[PDB]
Amino acid sequence: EDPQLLVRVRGGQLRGIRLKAPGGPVSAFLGIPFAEPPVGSRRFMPPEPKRPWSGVLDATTFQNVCYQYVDTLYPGFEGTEMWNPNRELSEDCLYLNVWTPYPRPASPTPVLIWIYGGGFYSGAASLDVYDGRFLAQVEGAVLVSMNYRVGTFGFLALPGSREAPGNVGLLDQRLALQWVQENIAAFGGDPMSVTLFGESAGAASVGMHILSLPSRSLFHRAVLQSGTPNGPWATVSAGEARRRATLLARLVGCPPGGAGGNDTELIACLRTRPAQDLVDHEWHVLPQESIFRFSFVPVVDGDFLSDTPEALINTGDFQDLQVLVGVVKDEGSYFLVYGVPGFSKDNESLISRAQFLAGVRIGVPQASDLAAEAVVLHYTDWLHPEDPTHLRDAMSAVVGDHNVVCPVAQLAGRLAAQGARVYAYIFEHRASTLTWPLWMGVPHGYEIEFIFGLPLDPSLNYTTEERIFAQRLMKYWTNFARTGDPNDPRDSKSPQWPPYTTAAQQYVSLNLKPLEVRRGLRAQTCAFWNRFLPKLLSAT
Numbered sequence: 385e386d387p388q389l390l391v392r393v394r395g396g397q398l399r400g401i402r403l404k405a406p407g408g409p410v411s412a413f414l415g416i417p418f419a420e421p422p423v424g425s426r427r428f429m430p431p432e433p434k435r436p437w438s439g440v441l442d443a444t445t446f447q448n449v450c451y452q453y454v455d456t457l458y459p460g461f462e463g464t465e466m467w468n469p470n471r472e473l474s475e476d477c478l479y480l481n482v483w484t485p486y487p488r489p490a491s492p493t494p495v496l497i498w499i500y501g502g503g504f505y506s507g508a509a510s511l512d513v514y515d516g517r518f519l520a521q522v523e524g525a526v527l528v529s530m531n532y533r534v535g536t537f538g539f540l541a542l543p544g545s546r547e548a549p550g551n552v553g554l555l556d557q558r559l560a561l562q563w564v565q566e567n568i569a570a571f572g573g574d575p576m577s578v579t580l581f582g583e584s585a586g587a588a589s590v591g592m593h594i595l596s597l598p599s600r601s602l603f604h605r606a607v608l609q610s611g612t613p614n615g616p617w618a619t620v621s622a623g624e625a626r627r628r629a630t631l632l633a634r635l636v637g638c639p640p641g642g643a644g645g646n647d648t649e650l651i652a653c654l655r656t657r658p659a660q661d662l663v664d665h666e667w668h669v670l671p672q673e674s675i676f677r678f679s680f681v682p683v684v685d686g687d688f689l690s691d692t693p694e695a696l697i698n699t700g701d702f703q704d705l706q707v708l709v710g711v712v713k714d715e716g717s718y719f720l721v722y723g724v725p726g727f728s729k730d731n732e733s734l735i736s737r738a739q740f741l742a743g744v745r746i747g748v749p750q751a752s753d754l755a756a757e758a759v760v761l762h763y764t765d766w767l768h769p770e771d772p773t774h775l776r777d778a779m780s781a782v783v784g785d786h787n788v789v790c791p792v793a794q795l796a797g798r799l800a801a802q803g804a805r806v807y808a809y810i811f812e813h814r815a816s817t818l819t820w821p822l823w824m825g826v827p828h829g830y831e832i833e834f835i836f837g838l839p840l841d842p843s844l845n846y847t848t849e850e851r852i853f854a855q856r857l858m859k860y861w862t863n864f865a866r867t868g869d870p871n872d873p874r875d876s877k878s879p880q881w882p883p884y885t886t887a888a889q890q891y892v893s894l895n896l897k898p899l900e901v902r903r904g905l906r907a908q909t910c911a912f913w914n915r916f917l918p919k920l921l922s923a924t
C-alpha cells in the first residue's frame with residue numbers, strides 16, 4: 385500500500401495513482417464521487433451529498449463524462465474533437481479529480497479549482513487540455529476539477545417548481561467546492577486559500593459563484609478566462625427558461641396530450657425520457673437564428689442569482705476579492721464556422737458585404753434592425769466597405785466584442801470600481817500546433833493548453849519558446865492563486881503586471897515577448913456595446 389496514494393476523506397477511503405509528468409511523478413486521485421448520482425427521479429434536481437462508502441474506492445481512472453451533445457461539424461478534425469467527450473456518457477457523472485505533487489505535499493498547498501466550459505452544453509473535466517498533472521509537478525499545486533451537469537440535465541428549468549428548480553449544474557459545482565473545503569486538507573491542499581479558475585461557460589460559472597453568497601463563502605480568488613456572468617449568453621430570464629423547457633417537453637411528446645401547466649406532471653413525463661431524446665432535441669428550442677447561444681444556461685431564479693448578474697456586479701461590494709480576467713486575441717472567430725455563412729476552416733473565408741450584414745443579424749441575434757444598423761456602421765471601414773478581408777475580420781470582431789470582450793471590459797470596470805483588485809490580460813499567442821486555419825488568429829479556448837502547461841510534454845511537439853512561455857503563464861496563475869497577485873515577489877524584472885483600474889485601465893499582453901502594458905481594453909468599441917447599444921435596442 386502506498387501511503388501517498390491512500391486517502392481517507394469523509395465518505396471513506398480511496399486509492400490514487402502515481403503518474404509520470406515530464407519532470408517527475410505526481411499523485412492523481414481521479415473519479416472521486418461527490419454526489420449521489422442524479423439519475424432517474426433525481427433528474428433535473430439539485431445534487432445530494434455522496435452517501436459514505438466502505439472499502440477503498442478505486443480512484444485511479446477518470447469517471448464518466450456527463451450526458452451531452454457531441455460535436456460533429458468537422459469530424460476527424462482535431463480542432464473540434466479535442467473538446468469532445470473522451471469517456472462514456474452517463475447521467476451518473478458527478479465525480480471529481482485531484483492532482484497533487486508526489487509525495488503528497490507536506491505543508492497546506494494553495495488549491496486551484498477548475499471549472500470547464502462548453503456552452504453549458506458540452507463538457508468534461510477529463511479532456512487532455514484540462515490535465516492538472518503539469519501544474520502539480522511543476523508549480524507544486526493541488527489542482528481540483530469536477531464534472532458538472534451540462535445540457536437539459538444541468539439546466540432545464542421550470543422556475544419555482546420543486547422538481548426542476550434550475551441551475552442544478554451550478555449546484556453541482558458548488559457541492560464540489562464544499563467537498564474541497566471539507567476534504568482537500570487530506571491531500572495536502574489548504575482550504576484557507578482556494579482559487580477558482582474557468583473558461584467560456586466555466587468563467588461564467590466562476591462569475592456566478594462570486595455573485596451567489598453561499599458559493600462566495602467557499603473560496604477566495606477568481607480567474608475568469610474569456611467569459612463573464614454578465615453578457616448576452618450566460619443567463620436567461622425565468623420567463624424564457626420556462627418557455628424553453630415547456631417547448632422541449634412538447635418536442636419530445638411530453639405534454640403528453642397537450643398540457644404543461646402542472647409542472648410536476650411535466651417534469652415527471654420528461655424523466656421518463658431517454659437521455660439522448662433530450663439531447664437530440666435540446667437545441668431546437670432556441671428562439672432565433674444565432675451563434676454563441678445555447679438553449680439551457682444559468683437562470684435568473686432569484687435564488688442562486690438573487691438578481692440579474694449585471695445588477696449584482698453593479699451593486700455588490702467586492703473589497704474582499706481578487707480577480708484575474710482576460711480574453712484571447714480573436715474571441716469571435718471560432719464561432720463563425722458554426723452558423724455564419726461564408727466562413728469555413730478550409731479556406732480564407734473571404735466574404736461579401738451581404739454575407740457580412742446577414743452575419744451581423746446572426747451574430748447579434750437579439751438586435752433590432754436599428755441596433756444591427758449601428759453595429760454595421762461602427763464595424764465598417766467606410767473607405768473600403770467592400771473589402772472582403774476587412775469584412776471577415778470585422779465579423780470575427782463583432783462576435784468577439786459582443787459576446788466576450790466587452791463583457792470582460794464591463795465586469796473588470798465594475799469589479800474594480802466596487803472594491804475588488806482586478807488584473808487583466810490579453811492572450812496573443814497562436815500555438816505552433818494549432819489545427820485551425822490562419823484567418824482565425826488566436827481563437828477562443830486556445831490559451832488553456834498553455835495555462836495547464838501542456839507544452840512541457842515534449843511528445844506534444846510545441847517549440848522551446850512555447851515551453852518557456854507555458855512555464856511563465858503557470859507561474860503567473862499560481863502566483864495569483866497563492867497570493868491575489870500574479871507578479872513575482874522575489875523579483876522586479878518582468879516588468880510588473882499592474883492592477884486594472886477605472887482610472888488607468890491597464891492590462892498586459894501575454895505573448896512570447898516580455899510583458900507589455902496596454903491601456904484601454906477596446907475602450908471606445910466597448911463604450912458602444914455597453915453604454916449605447918442598450919439605450920438603443922431597448923426604447924425601440
Ligand SMILES: *[P@@](=O)(OCc1ccccc1O)Oc1ccccc1C
Pocket residue numbers: 467501502503504583584585586617675676677678718828829
Ligand atoms: P464556451 O462555452 O463556448 C461554446 C458556446 C458558448 C455559448 C454558446 C454556445 C457555445 O457553443 O466553450 C468553448 C468554445 C469553443 C471551444 C472550446 C470551448 C471550451
Ligand SMILES: *[C@@H]1O[C@H](CO)[C@@H](O)[C@H](O)[C@H]1NC(C)=O
Pocket residue numbers: 646648649
Ligand atoms: C397536478 O395535476 C394532476 C391532475 O392532472 C394531479 O394528479 C396532481 O396531484 C397535480 N400536482 C400537484 C403537485 O398539485
Ligand SMILES: [Cl-]
Pocket residue numbers: none
Ligand atoms: Cl423526492
Ligand SMILES: [Cl-]
Pocket residue numbers: none
Ligand atoms: Cl450597406
Ligand SMILES: [Cl-]
Pocket residue numbers: 777822823824825
Ligand atoms: Cl487575423
